[PDB]
Protein backbone atom coordinates (compact mmCIF):
# COMPACT_ATOMS: atom_id res chain seq x y z
CA UNK A 1 0.00 0.00 0.00
CA UNK A 2 3.10 2.18 -0.35
CA UNK A 3 4.73 3.00 -3.68
CA UNK A 4 8.46 3.81 -3.63
CA UNK A 5 7.93 4.62 0.04
CA UNK A 6 11.69 4.42 0.60
CA UNK A 7 12.22 7.38 -1.71
CA UNK A 8 12.29 10.18 0.83
CA UNK A 9 14.95 9.63 3.53
CA UNK A 10 17.37 8.22 0.97
CA UNK A 11 20.01 9.94 -1.13
CA UNK A 12 19.17 9.82 -4.82
CA UNK A 13 22.26 7.83 -5.83
CA UNK A 14 21.50 5.13 -3.26
CA UNK A 15 17.88 5.29 -4.42
CA UNK A 16 18.96 4.50 -7.97
CA UNK A 17 21.37 1.91 -6.55
CA UNK A 18 20.89 -1.66 -7.71
CA UNK A 19 20.45 -3.50 -4.41
CA UNK A 20 18.72 -0.79 -2.39
CA UNK A 21 15.64 -0.98 -4.59
CA UNK A 22 15.82 -4.77 -4.20
CA UNK A 23 15.76 -4.58 -0.42
CA UNK A 24 13.18 -1.79 -0.49
CA UNK A 25 10.69 -3.54 -2.73
CA UNK A 26 11.14 -6.91 -1.05
CA UNK A 27 10.33 -5.39 2.33
CA UNK A 28 7.45 -3.42 0.78
CA UNK A 29 6.10 -6.72 -0.54
CA UNK A 30 6.60 -8.38 2.85
CA UNK A 31 4.73 -5.66 4.70
CA UNK A 32 2.04 -5.68 2.00
CA UNK A 33 1.58 -9.41 2.54
CA UNK A 34 1.77 -9.67 6.32
CA UNK A 35 0.98 -6.39 8.11
CA UNK A 36 -1.47 -4.47 5.95
CA UNK A 37 -4.45 -6.91 5.89
CA UNK A 38 -4.69 -6.30 9.63
CA UNK A 39 -4.90 -2.59 8.87
CA UNK A 40 -7.61 -3.26 6.29
CA UNK A 41 -9.61 -5.35 8.75
CA UNK A 42 -9.31 -2.73 11.50
CA UNK A 43 -10.38 0.00 9.08
CA UNK A 44 -13.32 -2.19 8.08
CA UNK A 45 -14.14 -2.62 11.77
CA UNK A 46 -14.23 1.17 12.03
CA UNK A 47 -17.33 1.26 9.81
CA UNK A 48 -20.49 -0.75 10.42
CA UNK A 49 -20.86 -1.37 6.68
CA UNK A 50 -17.17 -1.86 5.86
CA UNK A 51 -16.50 -4.73 8.27
CA UNK A 52 -15.00 -7.84 6.70
CA UNK A 53 -16.91 -11.12 6.81
CA UNK A 54 -14.84 -12.69 9.60
CA UNK A 55 -15.55 -9.65 11.75
CA UNK A 56 -19.24 -9.74 10.84
CA UNK A 57 -19.83 -13.30 11.97
CA UNK A 58 -17.49 -12.70 14.91
CA UNK A 59 -19.73 -9.92 16.19
CA UNK A 60 -22.67 -12.14 15.25
CA UNK A 61 -21.66 -15.18 17.30
CA UNK A 62 -20.18 -13.27 20.23
CA UNK A 63 -23.72 -12.99 21.61
CA UNK A 64 -24.85 -16.33 20.19
CA UNK A 65 -26.28 -17.85 17.03
CA UNK A 66 -29.85 -17.67 18.38
CA UNK A 67 -29.91 -13.87 18.00
CA UNK A 68 -29.36 -13.68 14.22
CA UNK A 69 -30.78 -14.68 10.85
CA UNK A 70 -29.14 -17.39 8.73
CA UNK A 71 -29.07 -15.45 5.47
CA UNK A 72 -26.78 -15.61 2.45
CA UNK A 73 -27.18 -11.89 1.67
CA UNK A 74 -23.81 -10.95 3.10
CA UNK A 75 -24.11 -7.35 1.92
CA UNK A 76 -27.33 -7.16 3.92
CA UNK A 77 -25.72 -8.59 7.05
CA UNK A 78 -24.40 -5.14 8.08
CA UNK A 79 -27.74 -3.41 7.62
CA UNK A 80 -29.61 -6.36 9.10
CA UNK A 81 -27.51 -6.07 12.24
CA UNK A 82 -27.95 -2.29 12.12
CA UNK A 83 -31.72 -2.67 12.29
CA UNK A 84 -31.40 -5.49 14.82
CA UNK A 85 -29.43 -3.14 17.07
CA UNK A 86 -31.43 0.07 16.54
CA UNK A 87 -34.76 -1.74 17.00
CA UNK A 88 -34.05 -2.42 20.68
CA UNK A 89 -35.88 0.82 21.49
CA UNK A 90 -39.00 -0.12 19.47
CA UNK A 91 -38.85 -3.93 19.65
CA UNK A 92 -41.91 -4.36 21.86
CA UNK A 93 -44.07 -4.08 18.73
Amino acid sequence: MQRSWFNHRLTSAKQKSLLYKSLADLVQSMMDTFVDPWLERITNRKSIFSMSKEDLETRTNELGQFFTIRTSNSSSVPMLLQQRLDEIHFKGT
Binding site: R9, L10, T11, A13, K14
Partner: protein, 112 residues
Protein backbone atom coordinates in the same frame (compact mmCIF):
# COMPACT_ATOMS: atom_id res chain seq x y z
CA UNK B 1 33.23 -13.20 -8.78
CA UNK B 2 32.53 -9.48 -8.38
CA UNK B 3 34.29 -7.27 -5.82
CA UNK B 4 32.67 -4.52 -3.75
CA UNK B 5 33.11 -0.84 -3.01
CA UNK B 6 33.19 1.42 0.04
CA UNK B 7 30.61 4.12 -0.77
CA UNK B 8 27.91 3.09 1.73
CA UNK B 9 28.81 -0.58 1.16
CA UNK B 10 32.17 -1.46 2.79
CA UNK B 11 35.78 -0.36 2.78
CA UNK B 12 36.99 -2.85 5.35
CA UNK B 13 35.24 -4.70 8.14
CA UNK B 14 36.58 -2.56 11.01
CA UNK B 15 39.44 -0.10 11.56
CA UNK B 16 42.47 -2.15 10.56
CA UNK B 17 43.82 0.22 7.90
CA UNK B 18 43.32 3.16 10.23
CA UNK B 19 43.58 6.28 8.10
CA UNK B 20 41.84 5.01 4.98
CA UNK B 21 39.17 3.60 7.30
CA UNK B 22 38.57 7.02 8.84
CA UNK B 23 38.57 8.53 5.37
CA UNK B 24 35.91 6.03 4.37
CA UNK B 25 33.79 6.86 7.42
CA UNK B 26 34.05 10.56 6.63
CA UNK B 27 33.17 9.68 3.04
CA UNK B 28 29.79 8.24 3.94
CA UNK B 29 29.41 11.20 6.25
CA UNK B 30 29.98 13.70 3.46
CA UNK B 31 28.03 11.89 0.75
CA UNK B 32 24.73 12.49 2.60
CA UNK B 33 22.71 15.70 2.89
CA UNK B 34 20.21 17.04 5.40
CA UNK B 35 16.77 15.49 5.32
CA UNK B 36 18.09 12.33 3.64
CA UNK B 37 18.77 10.29 6.79
CA UNK B 38 16.55 9.18 9.65
CA UNK B 39 17.08 10.13 13.28
CA UNK B 40 19.71 12.83 12.69
CA UNK B 41 18.74 14.84 9.60
CA UNK B 42 21.56 17.26 10.45
CA UNK B 43 23.98 14.32 10.13
CA UNK B 44 26.08 14.35 6.98
CA UNK B 45 27.38 17.04 4.69
CA UNK B 46 25.77 20.44 4.99
CA UNK B 47 25.95 21.43 1.35
CA UNK B 48 22.35 22.69 1.77
CA UNK B 49 24.00 25.46 3.78
CA UNK B 50 27.22 25.83 1.82
CA UNK B 51 25.89 25.38 -1.69
CA UNK B 52 26.25 28.35 -4.00
CA UNK B 53 27.82 31.30 -2.20
CA UNK B 54 29.94 33.85 -4.11
CA UNK B 55 33.40 32.33 -4.45
CA UNK B 56 35.09 35.60 -3.43
CA UNK B 57 33.32 36.23 -0.08
CA UNK B 58 36.21 34.81 1.90
CA UNK B 59 34.55 35.70 5.20
CA UNK B 60 31.47 33.60 4.52
CA UNK B 61 33.57 30.76 3.13
CA UNK B 62 35.77 30.66 6.23
CA UNK B 63 32.72 30.91 8.49
CA UNK B 64 30.95 28.03 6.78
CA UNK B 65 34.04 25.82 6.67
CA UNK B 66 34.72 26.46 10.36
CA UNK B 67 31.16 25.67 11.38
CA UNK B 68 30.98 22.54 9.23
CA UNK B 69 34.28 21.21 10.55
CA UNK B 70 33.36 21.86 14.16
CA UNK B 71 29.97 20.19 13.83
CA UNK B 72 31.34 17.15 12.01
CA UNK B 73 34.02 16.85 14.70
CA UNK B 74 31.54 17.03 17.56
CA UNK B 75 29.45 14.58 15.54
CA UNK B 76 32.32 12.08 15.17
CA UNK B 77 34.89 12.75 17.92
CA UNK B 78 36.77 9.61 16.87
CA UNK B 79 38.19 11.36 13.80
CA UNK B 80 39.70 14.81 14.37
CA UNK B 81 40.69 16.98 11.42
CA UNK B 82 44.29 17.70 10.40
CA UNK B 83 44.20 19.55 7.09
CA UNK B 84 41.46 21.29 5.12
CA UNK B 85 42.34 23.07 1.87
CA UNK B 86 40.19 25.15 -0.51
CA UNK B 87 41.69 25.54 -3.99
CA UNK B 88 40.07 27.23 -6.98
CA UNK B 89 40.29 25.73 -10.46
CA UNK B 90 41.08 26.82 -14.00
CA UNK B 91 37.63 28.38 -14.39
CA UNK B 92 35.35 30.10 -11.91
CA UNK B 93 33.14 27.00 -12.03
CA UNK B 94 35.47 24.63 -10.15
CA UNK B 95 36.58 24.54 -6.52
CA UNK B 96 38.30 21.69 -4.70
CA UNK B 97 38.04 20.80 -1.02
CA UNK B 98 40.97 18.63 0.04
CA UNK B 99 40.73 16.96 3.44
CA UNK B 100 43.70 15.03 4.81
CA UNK B 101 44.00 13.30 8.14
CA UNK B 102 47.77 13.84 7.95
CA UNK B 103 48.08 11.44 5.00
CA UNK B 104 44.85 10.80 3.16
CA UNK B 105 44.62 13.93 0.97
CA UNK B 106 41.20 12.97 -0.35
CA UNK B 107 39.72 15.74 -2.46
CA UNK B 108 36.28 16.51 -3.87
CA UNK B 109 35.33 18.97 -6.60
CA UNK B 110 32.78 21.42 -5.25
CA UNK B 111 30.98 24.28 -6.97
CA UNK B 112 29.76 27.52 -5.46
Amino acid sequence: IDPLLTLELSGVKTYESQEEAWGARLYEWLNTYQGEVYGDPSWGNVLPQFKHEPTNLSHVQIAVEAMLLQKLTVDLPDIPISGLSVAEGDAFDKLKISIRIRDITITQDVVL
